[PDB]
Amino acid sequence: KGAYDTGTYANLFQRSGYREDEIKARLEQTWNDLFYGDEHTRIYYPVGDDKGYMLDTGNDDVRSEGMSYGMMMAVQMDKKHEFDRLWNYAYTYMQHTEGRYKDYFAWHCKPDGTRLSPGPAPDGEEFFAMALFFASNRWGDGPAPYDYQAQARKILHACLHQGEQGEGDPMWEPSNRLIKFIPELPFSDPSYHLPHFYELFAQYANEQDRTFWKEAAEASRAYLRTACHPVTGLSPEYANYDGTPAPVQLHGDFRHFYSDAYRVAANVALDWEWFRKDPWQVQQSNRIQAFFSDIDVSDYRRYTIEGEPFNEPAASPVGLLATNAMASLAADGPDADSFVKRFWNTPLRQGKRRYYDNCLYFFTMLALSGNYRVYQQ
Template sequence: MQKQLEGTFHTGNYTNLFAEYGFSETEIQNKLNDTWNQMFQGPEETRIYYEAGDSGGYLLDTGNLDVRTEGMSYGMMMAVQLDRKDVFDRIWYWAHTHMLLREGENAGYFAWSCHRDGTKNSNGPAPDGEEFFALALFFASHRWGDGHVPFNYSEQAKELLRICIHKGEDGIGKPMWNPDHKLIKFVPNCEFSDPSYHLPHFYTLFALWAYEEDRAFWTEAAEASRNYLQKACHPVTGLAAEYAYYDGTPNDERGYGHFFSDSYRVAANIGLDAYWFGGSEWHTDTVHRIQAFFTDKSPEDYRRYSLDGTPFEEKALHPVGLLATNAMGSLAAADSPHAKACVELFWQTPIRTGERRYYDNCLYLFSLLALSGHFKIWMPK
């Protein structure tokens, strides 16, 4: 059962791991539809998407009561994968109208946090939003075609990527990727990274579709990120820190040098990288280590951990998100002795309700899309 490791980019075969583990197509499709409906049009206890005015819409971080580029770009990726152009365009319109920074050193980036009325909480960006915006826009262009500004999706994506790597060459502002290491920064004015921001599978596609003069950079960035993740993930537990220096060592200057909320996404990213572009022994081994570490732990007792696995008293804020990303990692390690159990635990776990539901359920829907074969590379027609 290793065919998914050949890489869907080359084979066009989107393995449905749920089906391979024995779930029926009807069950899978119903769960996917139900999850989307609960998150995007369900009752208040599950909804995170809200329409705004005649043309806009936003995803609310229900734990912090703000709108973040993280969630907005996630919502766009979910919408393009599920062919919901109406929702995609509403989210992009809101982001482009309210979050785009039009002046100052960060002009061209997006404010990472806004109030629900569109007022900016910050004039700074968070690079994980920009990279998801860019690929979601490329996929929208390839699936639906470009329209008028701001729905000229491919041009918006190419221009955003240009700004991300060339900002500061005129002396104004900072790029989102370190030009020497080719590694994504936590924020443009900090010279350290966040391992969960590293999406080499995205950069491999940027190398095909960015402005021609930028494509070599993205090829190098993809290789650099894959190498970086190998340094950032602990050799025994597989765990990565929330913040890490460019050599992969944890950055605990602000208390983020442990395995906690941001870090959960690393397993999912490794899984999707292997799924799309073919897994290596490192992909498989790292996911196996992560899943093995959690195999004797119940979600109710997930905690903050040192990278060597030492637990803190502090409980995990997002246990549903953690078990979802561990399941998504199975795309890189379908034959791992813990892979099926992780997927089954995810399947049996409902989406989260209550004030902390936003982050957990975003990771939940991504994992559901990927494990069901619906997290696809949309190529130009």
């Protein structure tokens, strides 16, 4: 039985030998550095009386992934003031009130709130919805826009029913219950698949959509079994509905293992911890850890999914290490303890390119300390 049933969350740092007091302190120190740290470390910036944003330091913009990530970090750490500031920013500047993207969020804007392009990034919407359901369950609903449960249901309504609402498109393909890369294109991004979140959408979303969310959970677990390489455990950034790498796109070649694909190992391991439904998830976690067991983080590259290294280095090697270590929630092989200790000894990234690494880092620090939890009711 998973943590959803038992209420017990594995403290992998404690199992590795770290003291409960040091683990708590390290998690609180990670939060303080990311949200209130110095100018070379922090990624959260308050705005006036009631807003705040998560800055993509590398691109000098604010992304719906990043805002939704910040809200999930905040609710898991019981930080309601920061949650409400991030949510108010996303609600005020990024969420569409009309047109083909009604109730979706512009995927990026300038820090001042100016939208840069109207189209969404579906992984943003699913983190916004999960974080808002947890806000409702931990803290209770306030007046709009802080009526968390109704806001979450409104987002997931649009995710499934946008084509009925007007000229746009839903974020899930109805015929196969799989999330799409963007509403308009007929392929997916394996890192967007969160079967563990869809299990909870099946409990918390509008009653009419609960059967769909439960089928989406099963379809996504099966989809990941097709998308992850059976030898290396590596997955492509973009994949066809059948799990093979999607064709080269106008904006780049996403057939390889790079930034987006890092989250797959993290997502598989958390579904295993929460629901414990697909034992393949243990072997997938063992495979990716075995692949990286003898590779230095400073030497991480782009890889073909069959494990051929490019000369090109990883842009977010600390992010990749974080997701490899989060796989210890599921992995039972010879490398699981080593990755937990290597992660413990790795500090937050600093400087211009810190954003993506530091988001993935914080979620691993939550999960390995036993603090990435389901908030029920």
